[PDB]
Amino acid sequence: SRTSELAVGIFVIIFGIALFFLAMKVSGLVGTNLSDGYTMKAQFDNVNGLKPRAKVTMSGVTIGRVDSITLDPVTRLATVTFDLDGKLTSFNAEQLKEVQKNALDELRYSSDYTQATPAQQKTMEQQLISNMNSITSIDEDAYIMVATNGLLGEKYLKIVPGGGLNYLKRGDTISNTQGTMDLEDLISKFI
Amino acid sequence: SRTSELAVGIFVIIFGIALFFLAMKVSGLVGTNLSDGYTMKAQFDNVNGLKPRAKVTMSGVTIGRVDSITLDPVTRLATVTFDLDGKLTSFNAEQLKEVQKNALDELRYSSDYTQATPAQQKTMEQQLISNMNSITSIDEDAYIMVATNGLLGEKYLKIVPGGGLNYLKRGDTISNTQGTMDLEDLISKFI
Amino acid sequence: MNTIAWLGRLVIERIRGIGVAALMLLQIIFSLPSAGGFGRFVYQMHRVGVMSLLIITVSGLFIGLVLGLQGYSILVNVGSESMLGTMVSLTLLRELAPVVAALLFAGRAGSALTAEIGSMKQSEQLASMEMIGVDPLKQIVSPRLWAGIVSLPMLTVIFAAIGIVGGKLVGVDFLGVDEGSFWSGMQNNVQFGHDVVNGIIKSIVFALLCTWIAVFQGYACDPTPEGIATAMTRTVVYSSLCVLGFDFVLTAVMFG
Amino acid sequence: TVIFAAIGIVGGKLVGVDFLGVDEGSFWSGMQNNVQFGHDVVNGIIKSIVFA
């Protein structure tokens, strides 16, 4: 029975590394602590001091990370690649029933429902079937900008809702961006 | 136990070597090597605490290292050399047609052809000879300046695009610049 | 090829052993100790803990005197001498009082568990015990192991208490820092259930891997008094590799 | 102890530039202005002899 000690000596040392990678989940360096995350992108003109693995907030609740920051010199703009944690930026059975009846009554009101196709039975299901396929939370004129975290913090993407009427799926691009603020031009334009 | 010994060695040796390699790499030389690093120049009046091997930014993303800063002792001017990166810059071959088809709307533009002669017998060829060799992403209007990263941070070069007409070559001296303001002129301008 | 295969065999044998020490470890704890066990258990505390007490106060007094001495002089230049009490507390409590407490403990008592059992191996004072008939795994191992588990969290709190009270002595008695901003800097930033409690849960698994190796590597060693020192480093080497190797999983599970 | 502190500094570079995204130039030139040789590294040896 000389191989048994040997076998447990393998059984421990492969188990110790397995728990060692189990701590590599919640540590946050490798892997993401995100339950069914989904990617979105945005295009800026000034991403000064915005590292990868940054913070993405809605009003103060951190709901994402930042994965890669890319340029494209033919248009000289920035392009940010980020994923959001969604089970709390994504709706569910209550809110999907809530939003589908919201926009079909408000956006598709008598200004819009009584200016339309002949049969108002197929298009009424079109506004609801265009929403079940992974709608998130973010309206048509919500803007994304770069904050500065207090007074001497570090930069992070701030998603601000604009109220709006139509939302966007998992894969889109936010069309209302603005770059960071900088003390270089501002003191010159103040003095 | 030939098998045993051999196997043991294998793993051991592999690991060791790989490890040492990566380790020595994460320091000093070993890996530290850009791609397509050309060199531009500029001449300021007051660098003010700029360092060698600082950071160069196009919009906000990081594209360059600074080489050497020397002083010209007859007209009180510092001179900067820095090395950009040519996978982040230098429009691709398809972009080359895509910048020239925009330059066919810009450099050989309609009113631009209708400024000296509406045949462009010397204009369509002069725009085409200098662009096949060493076009660069930076404009002709675009001026450079020294930022400072918020409060006291590292002093890094900022490339403000200019929305120009032509571009520069790998080796030029970017003429239009502006130096940085120290905090002492900020004091005097304050009162 | 030759030396390579040699090293391979070496590693294999080593891993094989390690496993063994696991098979020893269940056989010590999965039995109820008899009468007379507590009397040796007290004497092991008398041997391991009480003897180890005089050391960790001095190295406890030291590190606080240093850490509050040098960071402040760069920190005072902006606006902060009131966060002096936070940075001394939160690096001792969640970072060093687990780690640096063991490396002084693996130094003193991480050796004296091996050489006391490297004692009974060279003069066959192990073998005579089996021959008369006891089992040293019940007799001379289990009261040694149970003191080693207990006495280290009994010290690393003691360590960090003088560790913080040391840095007070440089601050208020020589740097003239405000006492109220010192302590209330800590009170707001150092919770109990997340720092001091989770500074203990680090120090338990830093005590088990440090003391179980130092028992086993003194038991299953050959009685040669040269290799009693090569067995001595493998206490210290495998402790310090694992007391540092398991900080990085324990830092990540608590926070991050 | 020189060998120790050499990997000691090169260790902290690995957390900074490879995970915290810190600027490399401000990292090293932070040291080169503040760490003289004859007053720190030489007098880190003279401590380590009487400690040996």
Give strand pairing partners of B14: none
d(CA A88, CA A101): 20
Contacts of B154 in chain D (CB under 8 A): 23, 25-26
Selection from A65, A49, A67, A48 nearest residue A57 by Cα = A65
Using alpha carbons only, what angle is made at residue A185 by residues A147 and B171, rounded to the nearest 5 degrees? 105
Contacts of B107 (CB under 8 A, 6+ apart): B123, B127, B165, B166
Q: Which of C9, C10, C18 should be substituted to probe chain A, the one whose Cβ sees the most A Cβ atoms within 10 Å?
A: C18
Q: Is A51 within 8 Å of D19 when comparing Cβ atoms?
A: no
Would you state the structure tokens that stand for residue A27, as one six-digit string?
């540590």
CB C181 within 8 A of CB C76: no
- Residues 6+ away with beta carbon under 8 Å from A48: A146, A155, A179, A180, A182, B57, B60, B149
What are φ and ψ of residue D45, in 5° steps?
-80, -45
Inter-chain residue contact C12 with B13, CB threshold 8 Å: no
Residue D21 with chain A: CB contacts under 8 Å: 51-52
Nearest chain A Cα distance for residue C199, angstroms = 17
Q: Best mutation site among C15, C208, C254 for testing chain A: the one with the most A CBs within 10 Å?
A: C15
- Cβ–Cβ below 8 Å for A20 and C249: yes
Return d(Cα C213, Cα C18) in angstroms, integer: 9
Beta-carbon contacts of B48 under 8 Å, excluding residues fewer than 6 positions away, are: B146, B155, B179, B180, B182
Please report all neighbours of C, defined by 3+ CB atom pairs within 8 A: A, B
Query: Which residue does chain D place closest to A29, by CA atoms?
Result: D19
Given an 8 Å threshold on Cβ–Cβ distance, is C5 in contact with B13? no
Q: Which residues of B touch A180 (CB under 8 A)?
A: 60
Rounded-to-integer distance, Cα C156 and Cα C102, Å: 8
Q: Chain B: which residues have CB within 8 Å of chain D?
A: 26-27, 51-55, 65-66, 153-154, 156
Tokens of B22: 């990566």
Distance from the Cα of B146 to chain D's closest Cα (Å) equals 15
Cβ within 8 Å, pair C19-A27: no
From A45, A48, A134, A44, select the one nearest A82 (Cα to Cα).
Answer: A44
Interface touch D29/B53, C-beta < 8 Å: yes
**Cβ pair C132, C236 in contact under 8 A:** no
Radius of gyration of chain B (CA): 24
CB contact under 8 A, A76 and B59: yes
Give buried/exposed letters for D22-49 (b at 16+ CB in 10 A, else e): bbbbbeebeeeeeeeeeeeeeeeeeeee
d(CA B101, CA B121): 17
Q: In the sheet where A56-57 sits, what is the strand order?
A: A56-57, A157-160, A143-146
| Residue spans of alpha helices (H) in chain A | 2-26, 93-106, 123-129, 183-188
Measure in Å the smallest separation between the Cα of B153 and chain C Cα atoms: 14
User: Smallest CA–CA separation between C18 and chain A, in Å?
Assistant: 5
d(CA A63, CA A57): 6
Chain D CB contacts of B54 below 8 Å: 25-26
Distance CA C221, CA C227 (A): 8
A47 neighbors A65 (Cβ within 8 angstroms):
no
Check CB contact under 8 Å for A73 and B58.
Answer: yes
Residue for token digits 């000879």?
B129
Q: Do C15 and A6 touch (CB under 8 A)?
A: yes
Sign of the torsion angle spanned by Cα atoms A14, A20, A24, A25? positive
Residue in this structure with the two tokens 């010209």, named with its chain if needed:
B72
Name the residue in chain B with its Cα closest to that of D29.
Answer: B51
* Contact in structure between A41 and A173 (CB atoms under 8 Å): yes
Q: What is d(CA C152, CA C100) in angstroms, rounded to the nearest whole number?
A: 12
CA C165 to chain centre: 21
Helix (H, G, I), strand (E, B) or coil at A166: coil
Residues 8-27 of chain D whose Cβ lies under 8 A from any Cβ of chain B: 10, 13-14, 18, 23-26
Interface membership of A146 toward B (CB under 8 Å): no
C110 burial level (CB within 10 Å; 0-12, 13-18, 19+)? buried
Question: Could you identify the residue written with the tokens 């060829």?
Answer: B125
Return the structure tokens found at C89. Answer: 């507390």
Tokens matching residue A144: 């994304």
All residues of chain B having their beta carbon less than 8 Å from the beta carbon of residue A152 are 150-151
Nearest CA in chain B to A182: B150
The experimental method, as deposited, was: cryo-EM
Is the Cα torsion angle B94, B100, B105, B110 positive or negative in sign?
Answer: negative
| Phi and psi based region of residue C207 (left: phi greater than 0; alpha: psi -120 to 50; beta: remaining) | alpha
Tell me which chain B residues have a C-beta less than 8 angstroms from the C-beta of A49.
Answer: 60, 149-150
Minimal C-alpha gap between C205 and chain A (Å):
13
Q: What number of other Cβ atoms are within 10 A of residue C65's Cβ?
A: 17
Angstrom distance (rounded) from CA C97 to CA C146: 21
Order of strands across the sheet with B77-83?
B40-44, B77-83, B62-72, B55-57, B157-160, B143-146
User: SS3 string of chain B?
Assistant: CHHHHHHHHHHHHHHHHHHHHHHHHCCCCCCCCCCCCCCEEEEECCCCCCCCCCEEECCCCEEEEEEEEEEECCCCEEEEEEECCCCCCCCCHHHHHHHHHHHHHHCCCHHHHCCCCCCCCCHHHHHHHHHHCCCCCCCCCCEEEECCCCCCCCCCEEEECCCCCCCCCCCCECCCECCCCCHHHHHHHHC
Residue B50: name the closest of B157, B143, B132 by CA. B157
Kindly list the distances between the CA atom of residue C183 and the CA atoms of A126, C72, C73, C162, C186, in Å, as whole numbers in the listed order: 64, 16, 19, 15, 5
Structure tokens at A86: 């969604």
Residue of chain C nearest B6, judged by CA positions: C5
Token pair of B109 as six digits: 């533009």
Contact check, Cβ <8 Å, B52/D25: yes
Place of tokens 């429902």: A113
Name beta bridge partners: A188: none
What is the distance in angstroms between the CA of the first residue and the CA of the last residue of chain C?
Answer: 45
- Across-strand partners of A77? A72
Yes or no, beta carbons of C16 and A19 under 8 Å apart: no
- Quote the DSSP letter at residue A169: B
Which residues on C lie below 8 Å from B13 (Cβ)? 4
Q: How far is A187 from chain B (nearest CA, A)?
A: 9
Region of residue A155 (phi > 0: left; psi between -120 and 50: alpha; otherwise: beta): beta
Nearest Cα neighbor of A144 from A65, A44, A64, A61 is A44
Cα(D52)–Cα(D49) distance, rounded to whole angstroms?
A: 5
Question: Which one of D14, D23, D25 has the shortest CB-CB distance to B26?
Answer: D14
Of B26, B27, B154, which has the smallest distance from its Cβ to D26's Cβ?
A: B154
Q: Are strands A38-44 and A77-84 parallel, antiparallel or unpaired?
A: antiparallel
- How far apart CA A106 and CA A117 sit, in angstroms, is 18
Q: CB A52 to CB D21 under 8 A?
A: yes
